Design a protein around this ligand. Sequence first.
Ligand SMILES: Cc1cc2nc3c(=O)[nH]c(=O)nc-3n(C[C@H](O)[C@H](O)[C@H](O)COP(=O)(O)OP(=O)(O)OC[C@H]3O[C@@H](n4cnc5c(N)ncnc54)[C@H](O)[C@@H]3O)c2cc1C
Ligand SMILES: Cc1cc2nc3c(=O)[nH]c(=O)nc-3n(C[C@H](O)[C@H](O)[C@H](O)COP(=O)(O)OP(=O)(O)OC[C@H]3O[C@@H](n4cnc5c(N)ncnc54)[C@H](O)[C@@H]3O)c2cc1C
Lengths: 129, 129
Amino acid sequence: MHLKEKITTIIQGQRTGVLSTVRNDKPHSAFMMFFHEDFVLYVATDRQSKKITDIENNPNVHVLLGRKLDEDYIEVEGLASIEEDSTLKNKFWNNSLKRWLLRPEDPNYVLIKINPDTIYYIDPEFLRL
Amino acid sequence: MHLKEKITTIIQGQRTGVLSTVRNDKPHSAFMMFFHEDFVLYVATDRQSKKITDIENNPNVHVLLGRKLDEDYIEVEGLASIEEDSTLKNKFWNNSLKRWLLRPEDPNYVLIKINPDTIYYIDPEFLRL
Ligand SMILES: Cc1cc2nc3c(=O)[nH]c(=O)nc-3n(C[C@H](O)[C@H](O)[C@H](O)COP(=O)(O)OP(=O)(O)OC[C@H]3O[C@@H](n4cnc5c(N)ncnc54)[C@H](O)[C@@H]3O)c2cc1C
Ligand SMILES: Cc1cc2nc3c(=O)[nH]c(=O)nc-3n(C[C@H](O)[C@H](O)[C@H](O)COP(=O)(O)OP(=O)(O)OC[C@H]3O[C@@H](n4cnc5c(N)ncnc54)[C@H](O)[C@@H]3O)c2cc1C
């Protein structure tokens, strides 16, 4: 059976997805580049980001990633935390991030770590993690 | 000055965006086709949709619409309601909706009406409505 592979395929493809959070009891969504270690997703951002404040107030997040109307994609539900591990920060660093961060040593660079509870594969089957 | 025009340009372009809602105190986002009357956005969906239940429980919604990493787009914050007006339903009907609805007379077809409070134009300037 191919669900983990179908999901990994999506996660191993294009990087831009949508990260949604709750912000003062209202939804907020932003385009973000996604990296990963196995099924754990990571987004590089500035530590003063409102998404970081959102996560500070409610850790539940939702991800749409992978997307013609009939392309396959995934939806991820899980809890987020902030990750400042130098090894992961240096691993994921790349020049597209220069829009928002200076360099891998920028003190403002943090990762949002998303620990998935449920991954739905659309085109739903799901994986519980 | 060109903000209303910049926004209308986005709203008059490709139709697929992201509709985010709050679902049991957690964020949820879905790809949806967007229609509009002036700056009021509408999405056609099935009346048993969980997005409808979400909106039933918290009317605040967020839209990303319009999107290369440096394409322009908009973010919309506002309150949603359900619209069953036959004139609008027939106006927006088209065959892409056949994935989710039978025909314009399908009793399951409703519109989600999004009354914007704030529209941000990204590439932010904003309009209050
Ligand atoms: C394809 C793509 C990929 C991207 N990838 C990344 C990424 O990997 N990492 C990254 O950091 N960023 C990335 N971005 C940028 C990110 O989507 C935006 O910076 C987004 O606004 C971040 O949301 P935030 O709440 O953290 O933003 P913040 O900068 O903290 O605040 C902006 C938010 O506040 C609100 N706002 C906007 N303007 C005003 C204002 N005038 N007054 C009051 N409120 C306002 C809006 O809701 C907006 O989303 C990407 C953008 C694109 C298009
Ligand atoms: C480009 C694009 C455009 C689209 N445009 C439209 C549109 O205009 N109108 C429309 O109606 N739809 C549209 N869709 C489909 C829409 O995005 C999905 O149907 C989406 O899941 C709707 O969210 P919902 O909560 O209303 O879905 P519902 O069908 O009510 O429920 C599905 C949701 O429940 C959760 N779920 C999924 N599977 C399970 C399961 N196995 N067990 C428990 N929970 C589950 C997921 O979070 C999922 O989003 C579009 C899709 C794409 C890709």
